[PDB]
Write a protein that binds this ligand. Structure first.
Ligand SMILES: *[C@@H](CCC(=O)O)C(=O)O
Ligand SMILES: *[C@@H](CCC(=O)O)C(=O)O
Ligand SMILES: *[C@@H](CCC(=O)O)C(=O)O
Ligand SMILES: *[C@H](CCC(=O)O)C(=O)O
Lengths: 305, 305, 306, 305
């Protein structure tokens, strides 16, 4: 029942984690961002995902953020803690504590960097799936390892399997969905076509942080190729440096988060922010709480490490 | 002086981290392994590198292992703590403490998984290089990101830059070494030619864990293409699943570590162990402390997670 | 407003932290215990207090337990995280995170073991009081240091000061309450008289874990000195070894927690459990969810810590 | 043999842990202090004891400090890590890692604050004694619990039992030593008589941090009641606020550590420092490396917390 409901969510935001000047979490900024997400049709949140810089958190601040999100918003949105890890003990510890504070599901990446065998992946994934509902996250461009079809076709039969957050493209998604494997696209620039032509239930999105109502439009009803085309340049700019560099820069430019980065992330250059401001200005009415888009000066940004 | 001496080491072992039945470190097995390495010409150790499963350790056990290695062996071998991370604060914290316990240098990977921009890499690497001597570790097959030449040509001018642990091949190494950038090969199957034909000072090795004296032979004196050819099948078998799966299985088969795996690593299959036993038997006299090679049964292996 | 409401709570339970066989938290047992507390009139919980073995937890499991308690029960009971420490940085880190997950207040002991000066105490307490509402916890029999009156009379003026959890007796409480300092008694065997004759708002209780409805009766309405007298033997048995040894043994005996101890705590002896079973049987109808009281055998107990 | 040697040490210093302005460890100041201790006849160190503010450290910095002390000084002095705790698992974890980095012994307090039964104490102490040589530390004025004689008479038979660090007085010590239980006095103002009239092997000292050569004189050869009398006022001043408040203030006043306190410790008042300067000036030639003795102004002190 909880499984069945979560499987049908079409718009999940991998929520940005905003920071105070000293690098600690800015919960007022986080809460304002989440409220705007929910008012614009976002049905769930990945807390401390790649976009949310989960890998730059200590576990105690991450479980705090998950707990806080459940307590403030868990009746209004699905709360999916990114509690996966390349260490099985670390994944199990974090995932168990995440469910203990009331998160609805986990996001579970395959072991990045410390790559394992097929047998290792089945052990790791079965163990985390036993803890509660899980989205399985495939992103070989980051992890160094593609989760193979054979693994997915086995673990998809687990009663806590929600689906894939698939980043290897719409052909991969089409093959999975044609065999009854539920998929979210992890790539904003592919998500419209994933949803409308390849059987994806929807998207786990970066760009929704900025324009949640427009990503909602892209995921519901008839294909909207005009909106998809109108968002193309913005979506490319969101990944001109690795995510979440553009997102972090964009939210600062829109007055929605402080210009504070945890290293090793640093902001986009002045020239890239100039290009970005034009793209953000075109959709400013759909950036909730945005009063104006500023290019910003290099000295405004604070690096914490 | 310390920098100049470390730059000349030809055989460094990325030492395996052996485990007790309960998953904690087996320091008697570790110490026996290290002593065998030293008696066979190994000049340095990476402590808790990829091969040593540093990513599966908590920091307190990792700093303990580094400290233990310095105190027991630091007058007999170079001790290089793998204190890098995809989190800049984590890298700085670990690297500082590692130097405070007397390690001679660090190994510093680029941020894996949470990939950053060129500006981010320069910030991250300059910060860790300021802590003390560092080997810079490029392995895009694991990290999802190649450290580009432009970055290396900038950071190689740092006074604490020891060189690259380069895994993208002998052509990469030849270009770097021809421009005065010191390189160790990170690939055993390429290391002989890296050393003898491409200017590499030597190797940071996995296979040295098993046959340290033979890896020593490959790094010193005349080219030895016969030995290199004789070790080809063994070297391929060492990577038939991702490292350190074969290594961990091999050491158990040879009676040199307990058959205990921290998840997500699991042993090679029975069939793969059969193939391996034949290859290990061919070099048994060069496996220090090995009394016999056993194929082993599946039930003998213990998984901790 | 939040301060004013919290100051009036009369029955707070220093909730026991139950364990699985492997020593990790048993949240099903914890949640069953808490629900029974709330149905019997308990108005607040100290999470990971002395009784809850907060000092045997890692911070991540402690913040998890606080967060879990807020999310499952925070609309039905006050959640007071025991986030104090003898390390000021540790106290500030834990207390801040505790409030960030929605706890209503903290419990703040003076630095035990690593005892400091009067100036040190004022610095430490002002710092933790700035984080949010706090109960200040004085128990020199455990800490090695009595928080002196002059310190209390200074820090009681902080707008986040809720009161003392005072363990040095009813005379101490009477002096504080006569000068406008809100107090809860930390001693069950003194709590009835603290409440009814010495101006204490009520009790932060151990025995409420076992008989919450009876402790509720002792704290509300008219004096009930007969009930207080009737509970005297049980209350003494609850402290025949240092708390929470008897509590942990009792909840196992009553089938309300597994017989699992984190070291350095170990169960009461067989002979002490025999005496206890008789006392627990007398009040079994007031032990919520208790199906029977067993003496238990020594081999049933599991010690975790190695 | 190691046990027998350690049992005979007469002067052990509970070494102060000096801090940088930002509150992190000042290892240059620490190393200068330790070298001066060793040159003045100090035979061992308690690292991160009560006096060393072990309870204000994270375990990773504490094991670092132990490891550093072993590596720099372990051939010249006994290194005793204060790895005890009121949590048995925490004590075992820290004590094991401490021995793994080469410390010679542990200091093991009874569980403070979270007081346990007699059966609990025997379990706790047997467990930590099994890890390696241990001094057992009784200080009920801090812990809230006196370790009773029946516990001591049982655990004193353990082959790793070194003796008591006893703080309940010379009568307690005399009774223990008359029954074959080796004792160090934990109270500087009692230590001369403990040593010369009550069978104590010697002292685990605070005041030795300041005047190590004078504490050495009090522990060796004939009674020196004149020196003992001459040090009476200084010894009382060292405890006019709880240790290590006076020590921390004194070392700053003598230019031997920075005026930096980790909370909840704060310096002595101006008036107490005035009294102290007079007492320190009287023994200045016996304060190794001592600059002028300065009273100091209140604004010079830095509180970190
Ligand atoms: C998913 C976003 C996809 C990406 O940047 O690769 C997430 O968890 O942030
Ligand atoms: C280097 C080993 C090379 C590899 O497997 O990619 C190391 O640190 O283990
Ligand atoms: C022992 C010193 C005695 C004390 O102040 O109680 C120590 O470890 O510092
Ligand atoms: C309060 C109970 C008082 C005691 O046993 O000393 C608590 O936090 O457990």
């Amino acid at each position: 029942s909880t499984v069945d409901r979560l499987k049908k969510l079409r718009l999940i935001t991998a929520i940005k984690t905003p920071y105070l000047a000293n690098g600690k979490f800015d919960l007022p900024a986080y809460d304002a961002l989440v409220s705007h997400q929910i008012e614009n049709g976002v049905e769930g949140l990945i807390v401390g995902g790649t976009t949310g810089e989960g890998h730059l958190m200590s576990w105690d601040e991450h479980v705090m953020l998950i707990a806080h999100t459940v307590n403030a918003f868990g009746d209004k949105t699905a709360v999916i803690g990114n509690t996966g890890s390349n260490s099985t003990r670390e994944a199990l510890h974090a995932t168990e504590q995440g469910f203990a504070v009331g998160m609805h599901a986990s996001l579970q990446i395959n072991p990045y960097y410390g790559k394992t065998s097929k047998a290792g992946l089945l052990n790791h994934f079965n163990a985390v799936l036993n803890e509660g509902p899980a989205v399985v996250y495939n992103v070989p461009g980051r992890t160094g390892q593609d989760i193979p079809d054979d693994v997915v076709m086995e673990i998809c039969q687990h009663s806590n399997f929600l689906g894939m957050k698939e980043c290897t493209g719409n052909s991969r998604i089409k093959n999975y969905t044609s065999k009854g494997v539920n998929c979210w696209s992890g790539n904003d620039d592919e998500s419209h076509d994933a949803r409308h032509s390849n059987g994806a239930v929807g998207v786990i999105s970066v760009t929704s942080n900025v324009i949640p109502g427009l990503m909602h439009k892209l995921m519901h009803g008839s294909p909207d190729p005009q909106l998809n085309a109108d968002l193309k340049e913005l979506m490319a700019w969101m990944f001109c440096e690795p995510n979440p560099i553009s997102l972090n820069t964009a939210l600062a430019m829109c007055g929605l988060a402080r210009p504070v980065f945890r290293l090793p992330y640093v902001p986009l250059s002045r020239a890239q922010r100039e290009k970005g401001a034009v793209l953000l200005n075109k959709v400013q009415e759909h950036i909730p709480g945005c009063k104006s888009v500023r290019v910003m000066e290099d000295h405004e940004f604070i690096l914490v490490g």
